[PDB]
C-alpha cells in the first residue's frame, strides 16, 4: 500500500478539530471547534464552544469562517475537488466577509490534517463595527437558513430523500423508542425525538402507532390523530422503507419513512423524517468556486443575508480565497459551486456559550455529460 493522500483520507468519517482566535473591535475570543465529517454524504457534525466567555459577536456570523474539504463531491466531479487535493498539507483558506453598512471580517485559515484529525485554524480580525450595530448588538437570528430558489438540482433533492430515509429507519430502530411505542409513552417519547430534530435538519420527525396515529409531532396538537399524505401503509403494513413525496399537516414534503418493529419483527409503529419543499427548494447557499491559475488555488464569492430578529435582513458578503500549503499538484476545478445547507442547534447540557452545527455541503454545477 501507500500512504493516503488526497480523496483517499476522506473515504469515512474523519475527526475534525476547529480552532478561531477573533478579534472584533478590540474584542478578542477564542473558539474551540469539535466534531466529525463524511464526505461521504457531505456531513459536518461539529459542536463550538467559546473558551474566552461571551461571544462578543453573533454565532451564524462564524459559520462560514469555523472546512470544505468534506463537500460531497460526485465521482464526475472528483476530478474538481481543490479542497481535497491539497489533502493532507491542506491548504491556506482567507476570507473578507463584508457586512453592509458595518465592520467587515478578514479570516485567515490553515485547514491541514494534523494526525488523522482534520484541523481547521482561524485567525478572525474584525474591525469598522459599530456597537450598537446587529453584529456587536447580537440582533441576529440564532439559524443559517438560506433563502434561494436557484435551481433543479435534481440529485440533491434525491440526496435528501436519502438522508431522510437514514434518519426515518436509524429512529425506528432506536430501542428506547420501540418500547416507548409499545407502552404509548408519549413523554418518553417526546423526550427522545425532541433531541435530534433539534439537531436534524429536517423540517419535523412523526413518530406513529401501528395504525399510523400521531405519538409525535412538531405541533402537539397533532398528537393523536391520523397522519397525513396516504403513503404510510407501505411502512406499516409492508414493512417497508422508503421515500416519498406527500403533502401533510406542514405541506407538500419530502419524506422518508420507516417502520417500528418489535423483537418479533411485528410492526408496532411508524418514524416519517421529512423536508418541507418549501425549505428543500430555499434552504440552501451555493458557494460558486472558480479556479485562480495564478495562485494555484480557487476563489469563491457569495452572499449570505442573516435575519435581523424582528425583522430586516443584515448581508454578510463573502469573498474567499483558498491556496494550498505544499508544493505538490492540486486540482484546479471548472467552475462549480458548494450547495451548503447548515442547522443550528444548541446543546441542552452545556452551559457554556456555544454552538451546535449539522452541516451538509454537496458539490454541483457540472453535469455527467451524455449530450
Not at 485559515?109 to 446587529?134: H, W
Not at 418493529?261 to 425549505?279: H, L, R
Request: hydrophobic residues 35%; charged residues 25%.
Amino acid at each position: 500500500h501507500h500512504v493516503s493522500k488526497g480523496e483517499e483520507l476522506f473515504t469515512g468519517v474523519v475527526p475534525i478539530l476547529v480552532e478561531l482566535d477573533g478579534d472584533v473591535n478590540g474584542h478578542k475570543f477564542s473558539v474551540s471547534g469539535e466534531g466529525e465529517g463524511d464526505a461521504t454524504y457531505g456531513k459536518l457534525t461539529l459542536k463550538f464552544i467559546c473558551t474566552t466567555g461571551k461571544l462578543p459577536v453573533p454565532w451564524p456570523t462564524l459559520v462560514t469562517t469555523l472546512v470544505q474539504c468534506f463537500a460531497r463531491y460526485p465521482d464526475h466531479m472528483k476530478q474538481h475537488d481543490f479542497f481535497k487535493s491539497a489533502m493532507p498539507e491542506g491548504y491556506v483558506q482567507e476570507r473578507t466577509i463584508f457586512f453592509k453598512d458595518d465592520g467587515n471580517y478578514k479570516t485567515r485559515a490553515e485547514v491541514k490534517f494534523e494526525g488523522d484529525t482534520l484541523v481547521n485554524r482561524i485567525e478572525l480580525k474584525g474591525i469598522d463595527f459599530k456597537e450598537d450595530g446587529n453584529i456587536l448588538g447580537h440582533k441576529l437570528e440564532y439559524n443559517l437558513t438560506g433563502r434561494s430558489m436557484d435551481i433543479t438540482e435534481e440529485r440533491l433533492h434525491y440526496q435528501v430523500g436519502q438522508r431522510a430515509l437514514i434518519q426515518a429507519m436509524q429512529i425506528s430502530a432506536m430501542p428506547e423508542l420501540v418500547e416507548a411505542v409499545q407502552k404509548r409513552d408519549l413523554a418518553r417519547i417526546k423526550a427522545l425525538i425532541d433531541p435530534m430534530r433539534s439537531f436534524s435538519d429536517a423540517t419535523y420527525i412523526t413518530v406513529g402507532d401501528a395504525s399510523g396515529q400521531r405519538l409525535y409531532h412538531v405541533n402537539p396538537d397533532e398528537i393523536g390523530k391520523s397522519m397525513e399524505g396516504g403513503d404510510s401503509d407501505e411502512a406499516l403494513i409492508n414493512a417497508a422503507s422508503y421515500v416519498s413525496v406527500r403533502k401533510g399537516s406542514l405541506g407538500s414534503s419530502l419524506r422518508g419513512k420507516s417502520p417500528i418493529q418489535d423483537a418479533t419483527g411485528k410492526v408496532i409503529g411508524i418514524v416519517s423524517v421529512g423536508y418541507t419543499i418549501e425549505q428543500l427548494v430555499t434552504n440552501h447557499f451555493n458557494v460558486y468556486i472558480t479556479a485562480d491559475k495564478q495562485k494555484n488555488g480557487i476563489k469563491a464569492n457569495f452572499k449570505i443575508r442573516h435575519n435581523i430578529e424582528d425583522g430586516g435582513v443584515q448581508l454578510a458578503d463573502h469573498y474567499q480565497q483558498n491556496t494550498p500549503i505544499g508544493d505538490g499538484p492540486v486540482l484546479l476545478p471548472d467552475n462549480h459551486y458548494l450547495s451548503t445547507q447548515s442547522k443550528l442547534s444548541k446543546d441542552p447540557n452545556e452551559k457554556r456559550d456555544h454552538m451546535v452545527l449539522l452541516e451538509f455541503v454537496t458539490a454541483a454545477g457540472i453535469t455527467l455529460g451524455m449530450d
